[PDB]
Design a protein around this nucleic acid. Structure first.
Ligand SMILES: Nc1ccn([C@@H]2O[C@H](COP(=O)(O)CP(=O)(O)OP(=O)(O)O)[C@@H](O)[C@H]2O)c(=O)n1
Lengths: 48, 49, 124, 195
DNA sequence: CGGCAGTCGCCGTGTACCTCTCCATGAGCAGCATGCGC
DNA sequence: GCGCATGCTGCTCATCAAAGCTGACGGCGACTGCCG
RNA sequence: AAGCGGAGAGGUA
C-alpha cells in the first residue's frame, strides 16, 4: 500500500512538472486520493 | 393477449391498470436503461441485450 | 517560419476533434492496434481517423552509458481524432483495454489545439 | 496535492458535512472531481456594478435580436421571391406551396435559435445574480462561461484544496451562535439538526 | 412546505489445545548455440 | 573453416480490474426521494 | 550468532 502511494505520488509530480493539460493532472489527483483512502481504511468506499 | 390468456385473476387487472407503458419498444428501452446504467439506450442494443 | 505554427495550421485544417482515452501501462500500442482493427472491421472510418501515442527519446543511463530510449510523455493515455457520435462513442468505449473517455465531470472533453501541438512536435 | 482523511468524511455521521453544512453526496462529488464549488464571492463589487452588467447583457440581447430580425427579413424576401417566381401560376403553385411552408419553417427555426441563445444568456445572468458560497455547479459550459466573461468578483475550485479553502474561510463563533439561537426559539426537525 | 415511510448500511455473534498442505504470472528483453552459406 | 543469422532460454518487471458470484440475520439510525 | 508471516482442511474437552 505504501508502494502504490509513493508510485502514484511520483507519477503525479512528474506529470505536473511537465505542464500537462489540467484534465490529466486532475485524473492523477483523483487516483492519488483513492490510493491514500485505500491505505488508511480499505473497503470503506468502492472495491477493496 | 394478456387478457386473452391471464383473464381469470384480479391482481393481473390491478397490475395492468397501473402500467402506463403500453409499448414493446418502450418496454425494451426501459429494461435496457434499468439494467445497464450509463449508456445510450439504442433500440438495437435494447432488443439484443 | 515556426514549425509549431505549421503543425498548428495543419491540425486546424484537419477534420474532427481530439480526445484522450485512459489505458493500461504497457498496452498503449496494443490498444492502438485494437482500435485500428475494430474500426476497420466495422467500417466506421468516417468517425475515427487517427491514433497516436506520443513518445520522446530520453537518455537512459545504463551505468553511465547514455542511450536514447523511447519514453511515453503521458503514460497510460492515448489520443484519438474523431467526431463524438453514439456509435463511435460506444465502439471506442467497448474496445478491449480502453478504460474510458477522460473528461471533466462526466462527459468527455476535447483538448485545445495548443496542447496537442505542444505534445506532438519532435523533441526527443 | 492535498488529500482528505477517510475517517472524517465517510463515517456516519459525516463529521466533515456537519461542519460545513453540506450533504454527503455533494462532498462525494466535490472531492472525487465531479463538480465545481464556489469557494468565495464578493458582494460589494457586484452590488456597485450591477447596472453596467445589466446594460452590457441588454446590449448583447439587442444585437442578437437585431441580427435575427435581419435574417428573418432575408427569409421573408426569399419567400416573396419564390411566390413571385413560380407560385403565382396555378400549375406550379401547389408545388411551390411546399417551398413556402419550408421557408416559414426556416423562419421558425431562426426564431428557435434566437430564443435558445437568449435563454442561454439569461440563464447565465440569473446564475450570476444568485451566487453564494458552497454552491454546486455541475455542467462545465456554464462555469467556463462565468469564469471567462465575469471571472472577476468570484472564485471557484474543484477537489480537496477547495475543501481546504472552505475550511479556511469558516468562522466557528458565528455559526455556533446561530445554532444556539435556533436552539433557543424553534421546534421540529430543525431543532434535531441544530443539536 | 411538510411529513413520511421505506431502505440501506454498519455493528456484533464463547474459551484453551493438537496434526497436515500450499504461497503470481505472462510476456518482453537480451544471451547465447547451432546451422548454413561463401 | 570462419562469419552471419535465427531460434531455446535465462533474467526481469508490473499493479486499473471485473468477470465472476448466488445458502445469515437482528438492532439502530441517517437519509432520501416521494407523496400530499 | 540465528529464524519463526498469511490461507485452507481435519480433530480433542
Ligand atoms: N463445544 C464445547 C464442548 C465441551 N466443552 C467443555 O467440555 C465439557 C463437556 O462436557 P460433556 O457434555 O462432554 C459431559 P458433562 O458436561 O460433564 O455432563 P455429564 O457428566 O452428566 O455427562 C463442558 O464442561 C464444557 O466446559 C466446551 O467448553 N465447548
Amino acid at each position: 500500500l505504501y508502494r502504490r502511494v509513493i508510485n502514484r505520488n511520483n507519477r503525479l509530480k512528474r506529470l505536473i512538472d511537465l505542464g500537462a493539460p489540467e484534465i490529466i493532472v486532475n485524473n492523477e489527483k483523483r487516483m492519488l486520493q483513492e490510493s491514500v483512502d485505500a491505505l488508511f481504511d480499505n473497503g470503506r468506499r468502492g472495491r477493496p | 393477449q394478456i387478457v386473452e390468456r391471464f383473464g381469470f385473476s384480479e391482481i393481473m387487472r390491478s397490475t395492468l391498470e397501473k402500467d402506463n407503458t403500453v409499448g414493446t419498444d418502450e418496454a425494451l428501452l426501459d429494461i435496457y436503461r434499468k439494467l445497464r446504467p450509463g449508456e445510450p439506450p439504442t433500440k438495437e442494443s435494447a432488443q439484443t441485450l | 517560419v515556426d514549425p509549431a505554427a505549421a503543425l498548428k495550421a495543419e491540425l486546424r485544417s484537419k477534420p474532427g476533434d481530439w480526445y484522450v482515452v485512459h489505458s493500461y501501462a504497457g498496452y498503449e500500442n496494443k490498444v492502438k492496434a485494437n482500435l485500428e482493427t475494430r474500426v476497420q472491421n466495422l467500417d466506421v472510418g468516417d468517425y475515427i481517423f487517427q491514433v497516436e501515442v506520443p513518445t520522446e527519446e530520453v537518455t537512459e543511463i545504463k551505468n553511465g552509458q547514455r542511450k536514447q530510449v523511447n519514453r511515453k510523455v503521458l503514460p497510460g493515455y492515448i489520443l484519438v481524432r474523431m467526431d463524438l457520435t453514439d456509435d463511435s462513442w460506444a465502439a471506442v468505449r467497448n474496445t478491449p483495454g480502453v478504460t474510458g473517455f477522460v473528461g471533466a465531470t462526466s462527459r468527455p472533453s476535447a483538448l485545445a489545439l495548443d496542447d496537442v501541438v505542444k505534445f506532438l512536435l519532435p523533441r526527443g | 496535492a492535498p488529500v482528505t482523511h477517510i475517517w472524517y468524511f465517510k463515517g456516519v455521521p459525516s463529521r466533515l458535512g456537519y461542519l460545513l453544512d453540506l450533504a454527503p453526496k455533494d462532498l462525494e462529488k466535490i472531492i472525487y472531481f465531479a463538480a465545481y464549488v464556489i469557494t468565495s464571492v464578493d458582494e460589494e463589487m457586484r452590488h456597485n456594478e450591477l447596472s453596467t452588467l445589466e446594460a452590457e447583457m441588454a446590449v448583447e440581447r439587442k444585437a442578437v435580436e437585431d441580427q435575427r430580425d435581419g435574417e428573418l427579413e432575408a427569409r421573408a424576401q426569399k419567400l416573396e421571391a419564390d411566390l413571385a417566381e413560380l407560385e403565382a401560376e396555378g400549375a406550379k403553385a401547389d408545388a411551390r406551396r411546399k417551398v413556402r411552408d419550408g421557408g416559414e419553417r426556416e423562419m421558425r427555426q431562426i426564431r428557435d435559435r434566437a430564443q435558445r441563445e437568449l435563454d442561454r444568456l439569461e440563464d447565465i445572468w440569473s446564475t450570476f445574480t444568485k451566487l453564494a458560497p458552497k454552491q454546486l455547479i455541475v455542467d462545465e459550459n456554464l462555469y467556463r462561461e462565468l469564469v471567462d466573461r465575469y471571472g472577476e468578483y468570484f472564485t471557484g475550485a474543484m477537489g480537496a484544496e477547495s475543501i481546504q479553502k472552505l475550511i479556511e474561510n469558516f468562522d466557528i463563533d458565528a455559526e455556533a451562535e446561530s445554532l444556539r439561537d435556533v436552539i433557543r426559539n424553534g421546534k421540529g426537525q430543525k431543532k434535531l439538526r441544530a443539536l
